[PDB]
Amino acid sequence: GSSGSSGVDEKALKHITEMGFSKEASRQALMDNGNNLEAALNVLLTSNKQKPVMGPPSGPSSG
């Protein structure tokens, strides 16, 4: 960090906040997932009442 800053990566925080994520939520998360830009959201989401949206259903195999 520069000029003494929390254990979070602002750059990663903002990028996330853009998707409507309380600074406190995204902040901690990132710090929890080791300043993980991706992991951050995952947590902020998993915890938040939201459903996983992974594009169209490709499925592994046509059973």
Side-chain angles (χ1 to χ4, degrees):
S2 66
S3 193
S5 170
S6 290
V8 56
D9 178 43
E10 269 290 304
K11 277 201 89 200
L13 163 85
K14 186 84 165 166
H15 178 71
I16 303 160
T17 63
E18 300 276 29
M19 288 170 273
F21 279 98
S22 58
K23 182 160 191 296
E24 59 189 78
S26 282
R27 178 189 165 185
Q28 193 89 107
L30 274 155
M31 304 210 310
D32 271 307
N33 300 250
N35 314 110
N36 272 356
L37 176 67
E38 270 151 76
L41 275 157
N42 306 263
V43 176
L44 304 152
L45 303 160
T46 49
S47 295
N48 197 50
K49 174 78 274 208
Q50 301 274 61
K51 295 188 87 273
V53 179
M54 192 182 257
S58 66
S61 74
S62 190

